[PDB]
Amino acid sequence: EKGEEIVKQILEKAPYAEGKVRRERRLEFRVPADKIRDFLRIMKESNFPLMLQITAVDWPKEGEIELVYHLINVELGTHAMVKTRIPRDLDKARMPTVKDIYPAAETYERDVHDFFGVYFEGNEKMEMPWILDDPERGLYPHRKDFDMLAYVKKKYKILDRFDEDKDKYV
Amino acid sequence: EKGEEIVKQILEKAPYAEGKVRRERRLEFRVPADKIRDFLRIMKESNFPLMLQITAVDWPKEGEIELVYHLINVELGTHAMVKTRIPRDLDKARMPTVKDIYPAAETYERDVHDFFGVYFEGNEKMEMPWILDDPERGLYPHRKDFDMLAYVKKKYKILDRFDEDKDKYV
Amino acid sequence: YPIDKDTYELFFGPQHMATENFSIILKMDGNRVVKAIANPGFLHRGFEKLAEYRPWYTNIALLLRICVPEPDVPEAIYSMAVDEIIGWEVPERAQWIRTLVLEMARVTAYLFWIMGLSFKLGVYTAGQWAAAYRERFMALFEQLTGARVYHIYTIPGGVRRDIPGDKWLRQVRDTVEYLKDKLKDFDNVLFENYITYKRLEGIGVMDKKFALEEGVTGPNLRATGVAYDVRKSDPYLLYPELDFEIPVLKEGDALARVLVRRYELEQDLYIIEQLLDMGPPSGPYKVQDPKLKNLPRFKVPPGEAFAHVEATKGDFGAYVVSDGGHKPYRVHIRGPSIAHGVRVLEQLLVGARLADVPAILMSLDNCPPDIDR
Amino acid sequence: FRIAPEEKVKKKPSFLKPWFGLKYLFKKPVTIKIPYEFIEPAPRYRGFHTLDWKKCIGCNMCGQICPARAIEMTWIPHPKIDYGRCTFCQFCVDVCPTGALGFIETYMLTTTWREEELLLYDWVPIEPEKFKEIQEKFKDYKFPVEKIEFNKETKEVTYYLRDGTTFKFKILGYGL
């Protein structure tokens, strides 16, 4: 109930913020892509200081890396899931970095940039070898264009010291 | 010229910001009333840290205290004049205070509230006797509903120790 | 029954001779300060609802008294603003005259700030010398325009009285060369002794992020790391053909904000020496003959204008709006010291000792006629 | 842009260097002994008013540019300037069309608490023969009216000058 009042207070301060309240405290809503940067500090200054991992799912059918952003409360205990939808090409993989408002996203953006796709403009720790050294940095292994068991075969010739065929699935 | 590029960069980050560039560096524009609070930190974070006096003109014909807000630059030298238009009744004299972004408006709002009209919600130094002690606080002497020379007569009986009539105008 | 029992509230009211005319109520803790709020407005003449009733030309003489130490910087900003809404053609001679009086009033205000600092820092000799050498600048202004202070000079177009001639322009060369030889005897009394340097060291530490966003516009945030001089950034009068050099420090304690004003005095006196060897060419002192007559009935076309100009304490602006008649609809004179010794002073006295409440009060050049307006 | 020092302005404190402020123990002290060494003020110092009674047309052009609203008009239609509310800004000089409102260097004017000496501040200014009260009568630079005898119902003010004419005239009516 109280989350409905909280999201009603948020919707007064923002128009493009269609808030669905799950079970009691799972306040999930989607925003457009290049509007969250002028929006996440509305969410910071209202009641949600702490930011969890910038987890980003992929979709090959509709090409878009839906970067959902996890926020959390400290006075009530709820957990926002504000999410965007940015295009899927590496040319169009652009997203403005949230470092001026959250120092939590100094390191979350490094993992989501080194794992798959997205490039964040106004940050300094970008080409640093954070994780996945060469030759794993040269291709992004956490999207759906990279399939396992055809790169592992090109990296290791045999997957069984023993016999017949323990390298397929199912 | 460079101010036109600066205001073009500002208009990318804000829609309701119709920017007119005077002589070289007098970038003046009007915004709606209850939208500057989500706007003045766009102007702060871009290039304009320092805020001068919140000067507010009055208009009795169209009832609105046009609170113009003076901003300034430090790297180029320009001076913004972002202005609103809030209604004129003391019931409707409401304006959200800019203290979370500017500590410059901790004291400018005290003078503009004690002089005429406007009441600022989220501030603590409001009913403090800043200036104009009793019985001058009980009526706002800087609007156009307060006329001189009919309050001065009710406060001081004679204005000339000498002769005939040195208390009128023109 | 005394309901605090812990913190005695001495407060420097008007009759104190350290603060000029603004009372700072200090919640003292033994010998430190734990809460320093100020009550300004012992001098509130009013200029918003008081300068709205006079015509456009005669609103000079009423507007001089918004800042007492500089009796030319308040008129030369309103004269710059009514210059803009009408759009005159102020000639080279009027521009040069207004330039030189805007810089000689600035060295007068620096000399007055030195004398005001030394009257509360104990040492009287740097006070008596500073007032003595301000008096010959006053007696040099008196040849030009009128009285000592509040010389109603710069009407909205041009000036009112031109130079007398070689009796005057040779005299300014004499007093400027004299005071440039004299200034090396101010250092040994005010800026070279190991008392003052040990008295103003580390008191009122102003941060770098604490000056630019606070309301500070003067030369005192320039002692903190800030590159902003309104004479250098946007030159207005005959400034671009001067080539002076501005001081910037990375410090921000109180004596950093005093040495910068001393160096500003040195380079401003070098400006007045550099401006004089140019010399003014010919031209009129007024601007135009036909659009000035019937001096009360002076209908200005509507609009608005902002101007702002360097002062001894703070780059302080004017705001004129014209309804379209012979009345300024609202002339706002932003005082330099509104958030420059009222709000930034509150977070500067917290922790400071009682001996450095007056010295901090003068290390920002607090002038009480600017908070009120 | 054109930052002057790197540490050039900041100087070194010093023990016994203030003794160079002790140099003026023997030079001539720079003061003026005012009783009685006079100063001789500027040739165009702004002072008091010297209306000419033969060029004044009573058009009240000065009335509307006085910033302090003291140039109110009388009849026999000349103005009386009171220095109660006057800032000596001399906007009443270069706005008077005919030229019948001058200003001469006279500023010293001290009156006491009694009302009979305070009627001294209501003077219709006299002709520029008052310049023969600035020179040729003991050049003291003081207000040469020095007492005023108003009289109710017989309104005939008397500027009892320094030794000259008593300058009687009647005043009836004010304003326009």
Ligand code: SF4
């Ligand atoms: S002397 Fe100055 S203030 Fe007095 S009436 Fe004349 S112009 Fe006005």
Ligand code: SF4
């Ligand atoms: S001095 Fe000038 S304005 Fe005053 S009454 Fe005489 S003519 Fe008129």
